[PDB]
Every structure is written in C-alpha cells, then in structure tokens.
Amino acid sequence: SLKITEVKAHALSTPIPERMRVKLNRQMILVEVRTDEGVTGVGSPSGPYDLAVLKRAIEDVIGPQLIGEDPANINYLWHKVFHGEVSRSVGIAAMSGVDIALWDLKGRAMNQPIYQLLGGKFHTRGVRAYASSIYWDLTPDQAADELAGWVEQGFTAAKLKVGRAPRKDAANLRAMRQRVGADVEILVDANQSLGRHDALAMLRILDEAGCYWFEEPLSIDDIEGHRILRAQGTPVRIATGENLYTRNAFNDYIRNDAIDVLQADASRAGGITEALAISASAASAHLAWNPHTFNDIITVAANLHLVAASPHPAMFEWDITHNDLMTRLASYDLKLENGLVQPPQGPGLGFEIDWDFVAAHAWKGEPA
Amino acid sequence: SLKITEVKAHALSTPIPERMRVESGAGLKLNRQMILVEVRTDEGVTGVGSPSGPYDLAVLKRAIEDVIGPQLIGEDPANINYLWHKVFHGEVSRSVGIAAMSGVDIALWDLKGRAMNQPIYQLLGGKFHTRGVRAYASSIYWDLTPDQAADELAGWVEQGFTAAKLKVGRAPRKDAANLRAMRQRVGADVEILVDANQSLGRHDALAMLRILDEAGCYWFEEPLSIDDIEGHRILRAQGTPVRIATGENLYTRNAFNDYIRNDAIDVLQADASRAGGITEALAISASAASAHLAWNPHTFNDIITVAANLHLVAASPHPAMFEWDITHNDLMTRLASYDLKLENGLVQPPQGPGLGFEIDWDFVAAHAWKGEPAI
Ligand SMILES: O=C(O)CCC(=O)C(=O)O
Ligand SMILES: [Mg+2]
Numbered sequence: 034s035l036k037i038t039e040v041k042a043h044a045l046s047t048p049i050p051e052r053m054r055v056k057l058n059r060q061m062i063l064v065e066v067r068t069d070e071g072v073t074g075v076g077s078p079s080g081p082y083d084l085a086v087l088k089r090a091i092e093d094v095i096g097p098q099l100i101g102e103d104p105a106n107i108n109y110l111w112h113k114v115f116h117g118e119v120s121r122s123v124g125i126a127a128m129s130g131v132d133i134a135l136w137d138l139k140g141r142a143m144n145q146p147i148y149q150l151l152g153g154k155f156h157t158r159g160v161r162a163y164a165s166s167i168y169w170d171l172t173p174d175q176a177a178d179e180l181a182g183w184v185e186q187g188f189t190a191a192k193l194k195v196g197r198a199p200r201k202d203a204a205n206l207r208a209m210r211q212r213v214g215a216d217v218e219i220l221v222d223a224n225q226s227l228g229r230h231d232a233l234a235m236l237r238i239l240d241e242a243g244c245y246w247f248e249e250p251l252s253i254d255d256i257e258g259h260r261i262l263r264a265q266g267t268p269v270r271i272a273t274g275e276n277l278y279t280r281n282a283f284n285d286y287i288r289n290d291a292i293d294v295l296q297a298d299a300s301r302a303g304g305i306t307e308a309l310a311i312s313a314s315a316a317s318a319h320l321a322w323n324p325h326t327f328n329d330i331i332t333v334a335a336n337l338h339l340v341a342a343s344p345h346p347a348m349f350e351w352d353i354t355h356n357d358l359m360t361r362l363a364s365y366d367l368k369l370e371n372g373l374v375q376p377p378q379g380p381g382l383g384f385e386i387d388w389d390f391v392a393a394h395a396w397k398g399e400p401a
Numbered sequence: 402s403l404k405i406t407e408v409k410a411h412a413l414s415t416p417i418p419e420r421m422r423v424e425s426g427a428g429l430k431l432n433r434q435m436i437l438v439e440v441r442t443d444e445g446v447t448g449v450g451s452p453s454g455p456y457d458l459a460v461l462k463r464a465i466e467d468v469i470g471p472q473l474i475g476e477d478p479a480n481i482n483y484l485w486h487k488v489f490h491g492e493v494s495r496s497v498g499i500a501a502m503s504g505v506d507i508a509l510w511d512l513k514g515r516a517m518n519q520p521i522y523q524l525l526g527g528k529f530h531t532r533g534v535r536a537y538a539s540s541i542y543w544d545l546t547p548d549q550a551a552d553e554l555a556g557w558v559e560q561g562f563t564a565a566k567l568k569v570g571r572a573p574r575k576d577a578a579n580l581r582a583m584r585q586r587v588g589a590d591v592e593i594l595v596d597a598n599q600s601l602g603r604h605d606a607l608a609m610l611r612i613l614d615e616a617g618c619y620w621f622e623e624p625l626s627i628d629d630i631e632g633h634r635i636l637r638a639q640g641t642p643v644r645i646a647t648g649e650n651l652y653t654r655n656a657f658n659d660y661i662r663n664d665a666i667d668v669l670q671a672d673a674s675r676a677g678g679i680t681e682a683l684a685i686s687a688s689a690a691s692a693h694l695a696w697n698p699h700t701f702n703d704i705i706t707v708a709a710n711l712h713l714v715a716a717s718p719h720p721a722m723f724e725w726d727i728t729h730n731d732l733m734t735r736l737a738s739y740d741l742k743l744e745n746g747l748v749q750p751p752q753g754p755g756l757g758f759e760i761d762w763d764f765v766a767a768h769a770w771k772g773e774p775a776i
C-alpha cells in the first residue's frame with residue numbers, strides 16, 4: 034500500500050523555429066506524482082493553457098487533496114477532487130494531467146502497460162494513424178505535395194486545416210484527392226470558423242472529395258447546427274470534441290443526433306478515467322471516439338493506450354509538426370507499419386522520461 | 402477616446418473571527434477572500450470588478466493580469482462588446498477563465514458608467530423596478546432544530562425581509578420538520594426558499610419536492626447535480642407550484658440554454674460575477690424572459706458582486722427575488738461606502754456613477770493577501 038508524498042507540475046516551454054511557424058512556443062506541464070515507496074507517475078494536462086495557472090492548480094489546489102492518499106484508488110481520488118474544491122475548463126484539464134499520472138503510477142507499480150489493465154488490446158495489429166496536420170495558406174500544388182509526402186512516409190490518412198478561404202480549401206482538396214487517389218483518407222478541420230450556411234456549402238465540397246470527416250465545422254455551442262450537417266446524410270463524418278470538457282456536454286451532442294465522431298482528449302476531458310466513460314458512451318450510441326491527442330508525447334500516449342484497447346474504428350491523430358515535446362521528451366517514437374502505430378510496451382505509459390531534456394526547458398515566462 | 406493602461410487584480414483576504422467547520426471535510430473556514438479587479442486608463446478613469454469566489458486567488462490574479470490584461474492594454478474600454486469577444490475567442494477559450502473574464506467585464510461596465518457619470522442601471526434602460534427590489538435573507542443553516550429554524554426566519558422577518566432561504570438535503574426528516582415549524586411561526590405571506598446544494602439524487606429530490614409543495618415553498622435550488630439536466634426536467638414535470646432553480650455553478654449561456662431547451666428550469670441563477678460579466682448576464686437574463694422563466698441571480702461573495710447583479714436586476718422585468726448574504730462578511734460592509742438598506746423588504750441599487758459607490762482603498766491596502774487559503 035503506497036502513499037502519495039508529492040504532486041509536482043513542471044512547466045516546460047520550447048520556442049518554435051521561425052521557418053516552421055504557421056505559434057510561438059510548444060508548452061506543457063509535466064505532472065509528477067511521487068510516493069513514499071519511490072513509485073512515480075507522470076502526466077500532462079494538454080495545452081496551450083497558461084502554465085502558471087496550471088502549475089498552481091495542480092500543486093496547490095489538487096495536490097493537497099492527494100498528499101497522504103493511497104494512489105491505487107484512482108476512482109475514489111477522481112471523485113474526491115471533483116467534489117473537493119475545483120467545482121465551486123482549465124480545472125478539468127488540471128485534473129486530467131493528475132489522473133494520467135495516477136494511471137501511469139498504477140501501471141508502473143504493477144509493471145504493466147496501461148492498455149493491459151484496460152482489458153488488453155482490441156487492435157492487436159496496431160492503430161491506424163493520421164498525419165496532423167497540413168495547415169492554412171497553401172496553394173493546391175503545395176497542399177497535394179505535403180500530402181503525397183506524408184503518404185510516402187507511410188501514413189494512409191492526413192488532416193487539412195480549412196475555413197479561412199473556402200474556395201482555396203476546395204481547390205486544395207481537389208488537387209489532393211487527384212494526387213493520392215481514393216485509398217488515402219483526407220480529413221478536414223475548420224476550427225469552428227464557419228457559420229451553418231458556409232459549413233453546408235463546405236460539406237458539399239467535402240462530400241465530392243470523399244473526405245473522412247469534417248472536424249469542428251461550427252462553434253461548439255451550436256449543437257443544432259451540427260445536427261443539421263449530420264442530417265444531410267453524406268458519408269462525411271461530423272466530428273468535434275477537443276474543446277469539450279465533460280460527459281455532460283458530449284451527451285448533449287449524442288442526445289441530439291449531432292455528432293458522428295467524439296474527439297474527447299484524455300488529457301483534457303478528465304483523464305484516462307473520464308475518457309474511458311466517454312469512449313463507452315460513444316460505443317453505446319454506435320458513434321466513434323477518435324480522440325484529439327495534439328500536444329506532447331504524454332497526451333498522445335495516454336490516448337493511445339485507450340484507443341488500442343477500444344473497439345472503435347481507429348483514426349488516430351499523430352502530430353507531425355516540429356515538436357520537441359513529441360520526439361525528445363521520452364524514449365518512445367513514431368513507428369508506422371502499414372499505416373499503423375502500436376502503443377508503448379513498457380510499464381504505465383510505457384516509456385522513460387528524458388529528465389535532462391526536462392531540466393533543460395523549464396519555463397521562464399514565455400507565451401504561445 | 403480612452404485607452405486602457407493597466408489591468409490589476411488585488412488579492413484580498415480577511416480573517417474569520419468565528420470558529421466554523423466546513424459543511425463536510427474536517428477543516429475550518431479561515432478567511433473571506435476576493436479579487437478586486439482594477440482597470441485603469443490613460444486619462445485616469447478607473448473601473449473595479451470582482452470575479453466572485455471561493456476560487457484560488459493566485460489562479461485568478463494570474464489569469465486577470467497576465468492572460469486577459471495583455472489583450473486589453475492600449476484598447477478603447479468603451480467597446481466592451483468587442484473586447485469581450487476579443488478575449489473570449491482569442492485566448493481564455495482554449496470556468497475560472499470565464500470567472501476571470503467576469504470580474505474584468507464588471508470593471509469595464511463600472512468604468513463606462515463612471516466615464517459617463519451614470520449608474521450602470523441607467524445605461525441598461527433605467528429601472529424596471531422603480532420602487533425597489535425584493536430581497537431574501539440567505540441563508541438559514543440546515544442542521545438546526547425546528548424552533549431554531551423558525552426563530553431565524555422570525556428574526557429575518559422582524560428585520561423587514563419578506564422572504565428567506567433554508568439549506569436542506571442533508572437530513573430530509575429534519576428539513577421537513579423545519580419547514581412545518583417555519584410555516585407555522587410566520588404563516589403564508591412570507592416566502593420560504595430552499596437550497597439543496599446538489600446534495601440529492603433524483604428520487605430523494607422527488608420525495609423532498611413533495612414536502613416543499615406541502616410547505617408552499619417558492620423554489621427548490623440546486624436540487625440535484627448541475628450535470629443532471631434530465632433530473633431537473635423530471636422535477637419540473639411534476640407540475641407543483643414550487644419553482645426549480647439552479648445556476649450559481651453554471652458559467653455559460655450554453656449550459657443555461659441546455660436547461661431551457663430541455664424544459665428543466667424555472668429560475669436561472671447565473672451570477673454576473675461568475676457567468677461572464679454584466680455582458681453575458683444581460684444575455685442570460687433576456688433568454689430567461691423570452692422563455693417566460695425568471696432570472697434571479699446568485700450574488701453571494703462581496704459588495705461588488707452584489708452591486709453588479711443588483712444594477713441588472715433593477716433594470717430587468719423579472720419578479721425580484723434578490724439574494725442578500727446575511728452572514729458576517731467585511732467584504733460586504735467595509736469594502737465600500739454602500740450597504741443594505743432594507744425598506745419595506747426592498748433594496749435599491751447604488752445611485753452613484755458606474756457600480757455607484759467609492760472603494761475604501763485603505764481597507765484594500767490593509768487586507769492584501771499573503772498566501773493563506775480560505776480553508
Ligand atoms: O455558502 C453558503 O452558505 C451559501 C452558498 C449558496 O448555495 C448560495 O448562496 O446560494
Ligand atoms: Mg482540431
């Protein structure tokens with residue numbers, strides 16, 4: 034029986050090189066939960082959110098509610114904190130990072146990867162990944178080149194940011210499909226930038242180009258607009274969720290027949306604990322859960338252990354942008370085999386932290 | 402035009418003299434705490450706000466000064482609508498983020514009213530409730546005995562209150578006994594409100610509702626977890642004369658819309674200092690009115706949160722049921738030159754510019770936070 038002695042939040046911030054910027058810094062909080070017997074777990078509450086707000090929430094609001102507690106009771110602790118002080122968002126985010134750390138700690142205590150605790154792999158072969166993402170302000174040829182580039186590197190799917198210039202978005206999509214043919218999935222992300230009627234015009238283009246999904250087509254507040262898009266009955270999936278923070282917001286999408294793909298992120302929506310609940314509610318409704326994963330290798334890994342164990346058709350976000358928090362933080366890297374990735378096979382999240390890298394990038398006050 | 406030069410968040414803390422344990426969780430209530438937001442301009446016109454509480458003072462100070470602040474420095478403060486959306490859609494989007502915005506928005510409205518030398522309610526179309534706003538005493542603690550509960554209610558009625566709120570849900574047999582004794586002591590003219598603080602499941606709430614109906618209670622506040630909209634609809638669907646109320650812990654129009662869409666609410670209790678400022682409270686109030694429901698805000702933290710809500714209530718066409726925190730609280734009585742004037746069971750908003758009173762800045766300087774938790 035362990036006891037928690039420390040809850041630490043390490044603020045990290047690395048500037049993005051000039052020629053890469055589409056974006057000032059890749060930031061994260063590396064949560065570290067320590068115990069009296071020396072078993073340690075780590076986590077990440079995603080981002081970008083203010084690092085000092087997160088650090089303060091984790092060490093000084095959540096932390097004291099955990100000191101002295103048996104880390105094994107993750108279910109109890111999640112509910113202790115939720116009905117502790119945070120309730121009376123960045124708070125759910127803060128909770129998520131701690132929750133992941135607790136799951137990592139649990140896997141490490143048992144010497145098992147997280148996915149083994151969750152019933153083992155569903156996707157034994159691996160998980161279909163997509164390249165995230167091809168960004169704004171490209172010509173048709175550049176968009177198609179970058180896509181062909183990802184395919185050549187082994188991806189069978191990629192995402193395109195759209196919504197700033199819909200006529201150009203359409204030109205891009207047509208060049209892309211033409212370049213790669215029908216066997217590559219092309220995903221689209223509008224980041225809430227469209228109203229209902231522009232989204233409907235866009236959906237007709239997506240349908241013609243055979244797009245896999247239309248992500249955040251509208252403001253997250255407009256559930257009815259999402260219902261309208263879904264109601265058009267195209268084979269293009271309506272997707273949202275990276276900016277939703279509760280089951281009792283995802284349920285409102287479900288109840289209203291408003292969504293095809295839930296994108297709840299374990300590092301944002303209440304941890305592995307709540308992501309398990311959100312994933313199951315999606316399954317119950319015969320809808321997909323394909324999480325947003327974009328921040329660092331910890332948020333990616335946390336989501337990947339759940340994805341690998343879930344029966345959902347996989348469409349797994351893999352950040353391909355220049356990001357030291359993806360490639361340098363830990364011993365686990367991208368490895369594609371026939372378009373598929375496999376979760377780390379070590380204990381807990383399944384890899385080791387490069388603590389030299391950690392200390393080298395402590396936050397000094399940088400924004401993003 | 403003016404330009405914003407500074408956005409400050411004064412963290413304030415005052416010691417609680419009485420020894421009071423928290424409702425549950427072996428700990429004492431140590432300090433009353435607040436952020437006093439201060440927005441300054443190049444021509445020296447200042448506005449103040451409060452993002453309510455209890456929230457972590459460091460979290461709020463950082464969010465106000467270092468996340469919102471930079472987005473406002475240099476901006477014209479007169480364009481509150483533009484700024485609200487510059488902030489909301491620019492940054493604090495991707496809560497305590499909405500809480501931080503709320504305090505800032507209130508300070509912008511205070512700044513505006515002061516710039517124009519007018520109280521906020523005048524900007525909002527002037528008074529609807531010209532004679533005053535009906536207040537209730539908040540709140541009678543639950544664990545009391547029937548005669549102790551009835552005595553507190555008698556006591557508030559004697560002070561001139563026409564309505565009071567009782568905490569319930571922790572021991573429904575006691576709750577039931579308290580209400581029978583209360584309704585006995587004062588009769589039928591006094592409104593009895595009830596607050597369960599989300600402590601009930603659906604079925605116990607349904608049992609409770611029957612007793613509230615019997616005692617002719619005005620509303621049933623936070624009968625259930627704020628995440629159980631369907632449960633609230635079920636309670637409302639029983640068709641009793643008891644209003645289903647919630648909202649002090651909801652922070653967006655969207656959450657309130659969800660309740661409305663689902664026939665789940667009678668009284669929205671969005672707090673201007675929590676739910677997105679006077680700006681968003683205006684929108685939430687109008688939505689209540691459009692659906693023929695009431696908006697009676699939660700107001701409980703300090704005189705600024707109270708005054709911000711009261712300016713809006715006074716200009717609004719809802720039947721008034723205005724929360725007056727009756728506990729010992731220096732942030733209610735010593736922060737500013739304005740106080741409770743109950744006359745015929747009614748309050749009036751402050752008559753000065755903006756929020757309508759002056760801050761006691763000596764009090765502020767003397768009560769600077771130094772790291773202590775509220776609990
Ligand atoms: O803190 C208290 O006792 C009152 C909180 C509450 O539920 C209210 O003011 O409505
Ligand atoms: Mg996205």
Ligand SMILES: [Mg+2]
Nearest residue numbers: 596622623649
């Ligand atoms: Mg209440």
